[PDB]
């Protein structure tokens, strides 16, 4: 199931996402993971977010992700990591 | 240990250097049982906690913002009793145990409270029970 | 003078929140936004 | 292993994952995506139960692409895209569209700004000025120093805070060591 969120600049799309986010958290703490997929500029501004609320303060079921820790995460289960990284250098 | 070996999530150096002796020993423990007879479990479980500025910085008292700490809970598993976490170290110990948990315990002291207080708040569930198994000896203490 | 009494003010003005300002947001218990 | 190995390796991984299957998923604050970061969305479409795709754009359309002077060819290119795969895979669609503003509610000028960015027959904003201004400085060095006087009078008159208050420069380069 895709879902298409669109609107002008300052909308409130980012406001709205967060939120739902924060409603999954309170309803199933444990429940199937949430993933929070934005920029790498953009993951710090999330997690500060997502945490700010009065009834929980954090989250454990939804995570952000950069595309680049979204591959770290599934790549150290479904494995490759151990694989020699090389610098552009 | 082969098969993280094949895909890659060990380095051959790595693979050669674990202790099975060491990573049997915990699943014939009284907690290792426990972890397997589980109506639910998860590992490798993130989480990111805000707590008050001052509730980990003493030195600065004067304001109460939030500050995010963030970390990997081990092992966490149900029983139809409650909700218990389990962490793993690689801690030195013997070279008895007993002299060691006191020590031990302090160690990871702060680190597990984070833990069950990231579990607790942010689940509103309740952490009843905390245990760490040491690869030295096959130890385990609870908290 | 005028603004004898801003200035004054203004001089000895500080930052109620500035206790703050040096804390890291994010602080890892083991991404270059946090710290340790 | 590349820097840029690691989203193929992602994409090609997705599959076999199983946590991430029944996973709910958001993307936002992109404008565009690459071929190789698009592999791993399509990937996530397939294996997800749900993602949803936030684009800041203005009823975009899946038929066409952008023409080149439109305002939101970037985002909107991304969606005609992103639509035609997930129309391709058969997935279940669904549109939200949000039309009032949202940041700019009590400051009409800067929603002035942001509609009336586009259209060159651009009426003008008949209003006071307060929230906009444009400034003149005598240089870079002048322009920061303004600058910082202005934003100790946001947090000291107006009751702002410094996480409030941000900055940008098209060239960083140019101010970052005065800054």
């Keep these: 199931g895709a879902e298409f969120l669109v609107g002008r600049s300052g909308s409130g799309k980012t406001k709205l996402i967060i939120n739902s986010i924060q409603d999954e958290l309170r309803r199933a703490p444990f429940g199937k993971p949430i993933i929070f997929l934005v920029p790498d500029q953009m993951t710090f501004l999330m997690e500060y977010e997502l945490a700010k609320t009065p009834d929980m303060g954090g989250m454990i079921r939804a995570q952000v992700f950069s595309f680049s820790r979204l591959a770290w995460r599934v790549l150290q289960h479904t494995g490759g990591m151990s694989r020699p990284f090389l610098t552009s250098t | 240990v082969h098969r993280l070996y094949e895909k890659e999530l060990l380095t051959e150096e790595q693979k050669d250097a674990i202790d099975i002796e060491e990573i049997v020993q915990f699943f014939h423990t009284e907690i290792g049982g426990q972890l397997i007879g589980a109506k639910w479990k998860d590992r490798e479980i993130p989480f990111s906690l805000a707590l008050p500025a001052k509730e980990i910085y003493p030195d600065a008292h004067e304001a109460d913002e939030p500050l995010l700490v963030q970390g990997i809970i081990d092992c966490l598993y149900e029983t139809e009793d409650g909700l218990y976490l389990l962490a793993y170290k690689s801690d030195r110990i013997e070279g008895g145990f007993e002299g060691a948990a006191p020590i031990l315990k302090k160690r990871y002291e702060t680190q597990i409270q984070l833990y069950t207080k990231a579990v607790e708040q942010i689940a509103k569930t309740k952490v009843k029970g905390c245990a760490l198994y040491f690869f030295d000896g096959g130890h385990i203490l609870t908290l | 003078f005028a603004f004898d009494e801003k200035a004054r003010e203004q001089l000895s003005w500080t930052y109620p929140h500035q206790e703050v300002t040096q804390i890291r947001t994010k602080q890892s218990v083991s991404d270059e936004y946090s710290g340790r | ?179």
Excluded at chain 4, 13 to 41: C, M, N, S, W
Excluded at chain 4, 55 to 74: G, I, N, Q, V
Excluded at chain 4, 95 to 111: D, I, N, Q, V
């Design chain 4, 1 to 179: 292993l590349h820097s840029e190995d690691y989203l193929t390796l992602l994409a090609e991984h997705i599959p076999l994952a199983e946590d991430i299957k029944g996973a709910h998923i958001y993307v936002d604050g992109f404008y565009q995506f690459t071929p190789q970061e698009f592999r791993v969305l399509e990937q996530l479409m397939v294996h997800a139960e749900h993602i949803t795709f936030s684009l800041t754009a203005d009823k975009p359309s899946y038929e066409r692409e952008p023409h080149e002077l439109e305002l939101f060819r970037m985002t909107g290119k991304t969606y005609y895209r992103l639509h035609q795969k997930a129309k391709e895979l058969n997935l279940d669609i669904t549109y939200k569209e949000l039309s009032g503003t949202e940041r700019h509610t009590k400051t009409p000028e800067l929603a002035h700004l942001e509609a009336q960015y586009e259209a060159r027959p651009a009426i003008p904003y008949a209003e006071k000025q307060e929230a906009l201004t444009v400034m003149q400085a005598a240089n870079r060095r002048a322009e920061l120093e303004g600058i910082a006087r202005e934003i100790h009078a946001l947090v000291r008159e107006k009751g702002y805070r410094y996480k409030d208050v941000a900055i940008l420069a098209r060239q960083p380069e140019d101010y970052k060591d005065m800054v």
